[PDB]
Amino acid sequence: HMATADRDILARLHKAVTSHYHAITQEFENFDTMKTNTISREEFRAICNRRVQILTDEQFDRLWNEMPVNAKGRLKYPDFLSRFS
């Protein structure tokens, strides 16, 4: 969506999700302590830090603009997993 979207970061995020699907899905599960199928923005960034790269605030803000986010500003991870896998 965003004009300054980084297709390289998006492409590598796709690769990361497919290559580490089992582990990443469980990271989501574990952060989702209430099991509402969502995790926090900062928790998602933590996953990005280790699975893709340590994004700058700007890069993360733009990446987040492309994510499936709910009314509370949380990541709808089942939707994320489907798209990036």
Side-chain angles (χ1 to χ4, degrees), residues 1-14 16-71 73-81 83-85:
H1 300 302
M2 309 308 285
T4 63
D6 192 317
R7 290 166 171 281
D8 172 42
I9 289 172
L10 285 165
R12 285 185 285 103
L13 182 55
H14 260 280
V17 173
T18 64
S19 289
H20 305 286
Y21 194 86
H22 295 192
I24 293 178
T25 293
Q26 289 301 302
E27 288 187 77
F28 281 132
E29 289 295 322
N30 285 154
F31 278 140
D32 183 12
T33 66
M34 299 302 292
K35 294 299 177 294
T36 51
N37 291 328
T38 63
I39 62 161
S40 79
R41 187 172 191 264
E42 299 65 49
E43 287 160 3
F44 175 59
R45 190 172 184 170
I47 292 173
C48 287
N49 283 169
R50 100 158 273 190
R51 303 300 181 172
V52 182
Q53 69 191 262
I54 294 171
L55 298 169
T56 61
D57 290 344
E58 177 57 31
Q59 297 177 315
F60 183 70
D61 286 346
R62 299 289 75 73
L63 176 62
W64 187 252
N65 283 154
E66 310 293 341
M67 302 295 100
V69 183
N70 74 182
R74 292 172 61 80
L75 179 74
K76 297 191 294 183
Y77 68 81
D79 305 44
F80 169 84
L81 290 169
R83 173 185 166 182
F84 289 85
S85 68

